[PDB]
Amino acid sequence: ITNAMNSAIIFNHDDPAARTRMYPGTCSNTHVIESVSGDSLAKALLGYDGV
């Protein structure tokens, strides 16, 4: 997903926390993350505080 986002946005999963987090990558200086949407995958990865 990070590679499909051209590393503009970084997705990282923390196995000790069992949590997925999203961070600004290469767009961090130019853009702000306003919102996240998508299908069942986006909801599954991010809808439950990253669980």
Partner: protein, 481 residues
């Protein structure tokens, strides 16, 4: 000629009112005050905040006095999804409007008065038979004249869509108990039910806490609208020091004691009502099932900064503050006759009491103190000191409306009853009457409740009695006790 003659038309009676007059209406006099500033500062809890848990905060020392204190609560927006569409449907149970336990409990009391084939009847016929049986029940129990069946068939226009909402006055309901502690000693304790009763009686017109605590005056459609998005609530904590500037808590005089607020939070299952039993409740932004870790709270404190001369004077001699403390008697009710033994201490200013049906609590209507069919749950009450009537038997309306009219800023919209020994129990600085319960061997509140109160589906209804009492907080050598 007439206006000058009025000033000359004085006798020996006017001398008691106007001779050597020390005041004029035609010139303002003002007093000079010392320099001070106010600062509002928000502070996080020292422990994690979660539903059903206890959390505490150690209050920072960011000024010389502590004045106002608000619990800032942040609640997420709610969404709902069908359990069949959810990858993890396992959640705590919530009260649901398709399973109205309060309406079912009310129907249970009128079942003996239903004439005809109730079990086999169509839904519309069952509603008619229940409304007719309500008339027969009320005629038999209360000698009530029958209401037209059409006037009892109030359809609450419930929306034809799925929803969940935070319960009425959620800002108070969340605070099951809060304790103000100094040096590890509990100085005062407040309860959710007491906070609501205090707002009903002492809440001033045009300054009601409605939006600040998530209260809609029982309009479910407004609770639904508010619950679709994040809510920020500012719940006032009505400690003795928040009532008047001269009672502000002297932080500088208590330098060697930690000041702590402890809060016991409501369980998440009690905070939410849903349209249907088969819905999962989701956090609206995160799209995950709502969980106990979604409660966020912080403490907003108003500090007072003093000029050095006043700060030094207060540090040298803070002396004593008159304080009001709260006491509670909590009892289960299983009979129409109830005696509450009020083991309260100190000079009691006043007490409040009210009842909650088990069915209203189970329906998530936590501040509905009404009886069966929304009636007054108390028929009469008596107050006894050492088995002698201090207040002889009086009807519910006297304890609810006459006591509120005499001693309070407002009359309660709910079935809250009060009694004052004080002429002005809302004055925080001027004692105006009390009864010393530490010198009474027995204090009994005897209640006659409505028929069938605490029977069947209402077994373990709740009686709340709260008292306000005077005590003294002493400051000496940087300690408070």
């Amino acid at each position: 000629a007439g206006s000058l003659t009025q000033l000359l038309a004085t006798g020996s009676m006017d001398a008691a009112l106007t001779q050597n007059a020390t005041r004029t209406f035609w010139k303002s006099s003002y007093q000079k005050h010392s320099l001070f500033a106010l600062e509002s500062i928000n502070q996080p809890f020292t422990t994690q905040v979660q539903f059903g848990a206890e959390s505490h905060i150690t209050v920072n020392r960011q000024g010389d006095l502590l004045s106002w204190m608000y619990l800032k609560i942040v609640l997420p927006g709610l969404k709902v999804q069908n359990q069949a569409d959810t990858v993890q449907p396992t959640q705590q149970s919530f009260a649901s409007l398709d399973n109205d336990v309060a309406a079912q409990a009310d129907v249970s009391h009128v079942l003996p008065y239903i004439e005809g084939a109730y079990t086999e009847a169509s839904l519309n016929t069952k509603e008619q038979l229940i409304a007719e049986a309500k008339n027969s029940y009320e005629a038999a129990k209360y000698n009530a004249a029958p209401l037209p069946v059409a006037a009892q068939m109030q359809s609450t226009e419930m929306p034809d869509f799925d929803y969940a909402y935070w319960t009425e006055a959620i800002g108070f309901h969340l605070i099951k108990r809060a304790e103000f502690k100094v040096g590890g000693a509990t100085i005062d304790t407040i309860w959710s039910e007491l906070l609501f009763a205090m707002e009903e009686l002492m809440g001033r017109a045009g300054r009601r806490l409605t939006e600040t605590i998530g209260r809609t005056l029982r309009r479910p459609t407004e609770l639904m609208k508010a619950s679709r998005q994040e809510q920020i609530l500012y719940v006032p904590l009505p400690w003795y020091f928040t009532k008047h500037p001269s009672l502000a808590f002297p932080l500088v005089a208590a330098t060697y004691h930690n000041i702590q607020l402890w809060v016991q939070w409501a369980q998440l299952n009690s905070c939410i009502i849903k349209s249907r039993s088969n819905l999962v409740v989701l956090h609206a932004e995160r799209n995950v099932p709502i969980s106990d870790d979604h409660l966020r709270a912080s403490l907003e404190c108003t500090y007072v900064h003093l000029e050095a001369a006043e700060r030094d004077a207060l540090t040298a001699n803070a002396g004593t503050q008159l304080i009001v403390q709260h006491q509670a008697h909590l009892q289960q009710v299983s009979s129409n006759n109830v005696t509450a033994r009020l083991n309260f201490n100190f000079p009691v200013l006043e007490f409040y009491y009210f009842l909650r049906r088990k069915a209203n609590k189970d329906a998530g209507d936590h501040f509905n103190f009404s009886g069966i069919g929304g009636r007054d749950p108390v028929v009469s009450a008596e107050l006894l000191f050492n088995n002698t009537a201090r207040v002889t038997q009086k009807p519910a309306v006297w304890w609810r409306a006459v006591q509120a009219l005499q001693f309070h800023s407002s009359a309660p919209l709910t079935n809250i009853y009060s009694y004052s020994f004080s002429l002005s129990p809302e004055d925080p600085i001027t004692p105006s009457g009390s009864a010393n319960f530490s010198r009474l061997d027995s204090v009994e509140l005897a209640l006659t409740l409505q028929d069938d109160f605490g029977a069947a589906h209402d077994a373990n209804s709740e009686l709340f009695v709260f008292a306000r009492s005077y005590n003294i907080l002493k400051f000496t050598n940087g300690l408070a006790g």
